[PDB]
Amino acid sequence: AMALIEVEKPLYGVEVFVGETAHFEIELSEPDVHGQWKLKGQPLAASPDCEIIEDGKKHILILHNCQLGMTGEVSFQAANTKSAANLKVKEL
Amino acid sequence: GAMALIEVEKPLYGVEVFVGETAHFEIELSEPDVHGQWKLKGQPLAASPDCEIIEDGKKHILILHNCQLGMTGEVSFQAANTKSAANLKVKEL
Amino acid sequence: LIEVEKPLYGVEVFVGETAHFEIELSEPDVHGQWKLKGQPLAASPDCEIIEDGKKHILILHNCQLGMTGEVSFQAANTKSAANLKVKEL
Amino acid sequence: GAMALIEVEKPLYGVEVFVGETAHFEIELSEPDVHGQWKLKGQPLAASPDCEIIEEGKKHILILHNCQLGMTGEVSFQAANTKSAANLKVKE
Amino acid sequence: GAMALIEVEKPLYGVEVFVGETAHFEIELSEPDVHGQWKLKGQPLAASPDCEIIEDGKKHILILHNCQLGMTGEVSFQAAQTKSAANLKVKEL
Amino acid sequence: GAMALIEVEKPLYGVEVFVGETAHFEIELSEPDVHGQWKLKGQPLAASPDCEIIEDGKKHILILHNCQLGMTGEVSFQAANTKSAANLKVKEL
Ligand SMILES: [Zn+2]
Ligand SMILES: [Zn+2]
Ligand SMILES: [Zn+2]
Ligand SMILES: [Zn+2]
Ligand SMILES: [Zn+2]
Ligand SMILES: [Zn+2]
Ligand SMILES: [Zn+2]
Ligand SMILES: [Zn+2]
Ligand SMILES: [Zn+2]
Ligand SMILES: [Zn+2]
Ligand SMILES: [Zn+2]
Ligand SMILES: [Zn+2]
Ligand SMILES: [Zn+2]
Ligand SMILES: [Zn+2]
Ligand SMILES: [Zn+2]
Ligand SMILES: [Zn+2]
Ligand SMILES: [Zn+2]
Ligand SMILES: [Zn+2]
Ligand SMILES: [Zn+2]
Ligand SMILES: [Zn+2]
Ligand SMILES: [Zn+2]
Ligand SMILES: [Zn+2]
Ligand SMILES: [Zn+2]
Ligand SMILES: [Zn+2]
């Protein structure tokens, strides 16, 4: 009988101008848990411009060269644990 | 600044599994600690008790428990510019 | 007390094929050691010893008749064993 | 035999944030699993809730929450032989 | 969530070494993957070839090569809440 | 897939230790995340409270607590290709 994984620090919303970078972070209740990030409900492919990072209880997503079409919900799920927040891309 | 592309050193290979059995896939990259993404039939896979995604140094492993007929198709993996694919054949015994 | 959450399970393989064992512990990053027939296992191309979080994995490639026997694992205080059966096709 | 020196592959670049927001810095090394040290205005950074030091593979990240005008200055990183610096500007 | 503070499961022990020799310190925390900082005589340690900072799961290690007499003093470690200290004594033959 | 063999970059050094104290061995390989095996007098080490096996990037470390006279002899490490050996010398104060 083991505890389900929980979100200790949820995702916060990010604002970013076109071409700049957005960073998201979430902290889980326990280290080394596997999860998956989505943007506007579509799973993210890792790329030079989309970097998926894990370090202990922390999960980080780095989105470089953000574009207007990217505005919408960023979400993360690792088993039971789920969090979501808004990404707003602005022009100047 | 001069860095080698990530390459596949040992590629995915095909597996045949009977229904209800588990299948495992593995690939070895040229560099350790490279983030990898797995897909089955073109759909990105997420970790769960029956779909375990494993990373250890240069090795990437996918374990699929309780395989079902409808899972037959291409398993693919991508890590940086490194890509590999092989077939999952589930047989009805 | 570090516990075993999902124990080793037995596996059957044909000669030449690969066998995989797996165990899930209650805690991640615990140093694990594997044995086959009571003999400690070193990593090699045909014997791959994997750790990722709570999961420990042993992959045995090109299995041979003489390898039939008990596969066992220990991490801190937790122990688990199961059988490898290699058979001719 | 010959071992390559660790190099900076993707250097630190400057970040500008407004007072009270968080700034994220990012550097990529030529090799994974290299132990790195961060500094802000020449002082070694101590990991905290507001000051998070992250490593994953070739990637090293520094997150500074609730930035203050007094924190404007040079952020530097060093790992083995590799060094990078960029500016944190907290904007009024 | 409601999380336990990091604790010290096994504290630093004192080390004594002759000059030129290496000292090794070891502390075990209650949780793996916790980030910490080492200090020597109250000063943050920079990680040269002679000063190696190591982490593996719940264990944190400091290796100091080529110890000199000036290094005699308190070695401390801090990871969030968790803190420990022990004496380094450097002796002349 | 055209890959370099793992090599020892920093070999094991010999350690002298008094009875009851702890000995610390370290070796550095040419690549991080390589799996290896430690031996004492040609016998594989079983990890225990007094026998700790540590990995961190290119570094491999062995910690032997509460050293006893009978433990004197060769300590070795091998990672596939790579092998290094050094002497453990336990003495009475
Ligand atoms: Zn940011
Ligand atoms: Zn971990
Ligand atoms: Zn970390
Ligand atoms: Zn980046
Ligand atoms: Zn416009
Ligand atoms: Zn090539
Ligand atoms: Zn990753
Ligand atoms: Zn499984
Ligand atoms: Zn490993
Ligand atoms: Zn219990
Ligand atoms: Zn249980
Ligand atoms: Zn398998
Ligand atoms: Zn280990
Ligand atoms: Zn393999
Ligand atoms: Zn993992
Ligand atoms: Zn060399
Ligand atoms: Zn480190
Ligand atoms: Zn944070
Ligand atoms: Zn020592
Ligand atoms: Zn050293
Ligand atoms: Zn290399
Ligand atoms: Zn690594
Ligand atoms: Zn110890
Ligand atoms: Zn490390």
Author numbering:
A (entry chain A): -2 to 89
B (entry chain D), E (entry chain F), F (entry chain C): -3 to 89
C (entry chain B): 1 to 89
D (entry chain E): -3 to 88
Sentences from the paper on this structure:
We apply the force distribution analysis to I27, an IG domain of the muscle protein titin and one of the most robust protein domains known. We have determined the first high-resolution crystal structure of I27, a cornerstone for the interpretation of force spectroscopy experiments and crucial for our analysis. We present here the first force distribution network in a protein at atomic detail, thereby revealing the force-bearing scaffold rendering I27 mechanically robust. The A'G strand, known to be crucial for mechanical resistance, forms a mechanical clamp.
There are six I27 molecules in the asymmetric unit arranged around the local non-crystallographic 6-fold axis, with the N-termini of I27 closest to the local axis and the C-termini pointing outward. The entire amino acid sequence from residue 1–89 is visible in electron density (except L89 in chain E), as well as an additional 3–4 residues left from the TEV cleavage site after the N-terminal H6-tag (-AMA- in chain A; none in chain B; and -GAMA- in chains C–F, see Methods). As a comparison, the RMSD between non-crystallographic symmetry-related chains in the I27 crystal structure ranges from 0.16–0.35Å. The present crystal structure of I27 represents an improved model for further studies because it does not contain potential structural perturbations introduced by unwanted mutations, and due to the high quality diffraction data, with overall coordinate error of 0.15Å. Overall, there are more and shorter H-bonds in the crystal structure comparing to the previously described NMR structure. An additional H-bond between E3 and S26 and a stronger bond between K6 and E24 are found between strands A and B. While the hydrogen bonding between the A' and G strand largely overlaps, the interaction between Y9-N83 is absent but E12-K87 are within interaction distance, the latter supposedly adding resistance. Of the two residues mutated in the NMR structure, T78 (first residue of strand G) makes a side chain H-bond interaction with the carbonyl oxygen of L2 (preceding strand A) which is absent in the NMR structure and which could potentially add further mechanical resistance to I27. A number of structural features, such as the A'G interstrand hydrogen bonds or the interactions involving T78, which was absent in the NMR structure due to the T78A mutation, are part of the force-bearing network. The determination of a refined crystal structure thus served as an important basis for our force distribution analysis.
